[PDB]
Design a protein around this ligand. Structure first.
Ligand SMILES: [Cl-]
Length: 65
């Protein structure tokens, strides 16, 4: 349950657990997201292995750099 008080979630500053609260993001993807930092824009998430456009499409409303 991703609480409202934690959104939008920062791709650059969130902890692993916070990223794992995002729909479709498990421990493996959360780890790759941290390892891929920094992100200049949310669309840079496409550099992370496993995050396809359909995945990203669902996450856009909840993310910020
Ligand atoms: Cl952005």
């Amino acid at each position: 349950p991703l609480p409202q008080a934690q959104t939008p979630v920062s791709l650059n500053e969130a902890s692993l657990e916070e990223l794992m609260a995002l729909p479709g993001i498990g421990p493996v993807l959360a780890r790759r997201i941290v390892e891929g930092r920094p992100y200049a824009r949310v669309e840079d998430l496409l550099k992370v292995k496993g995050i396809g456009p359909a995945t990203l499409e669902r996450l856009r409303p909840y993310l910020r750099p």
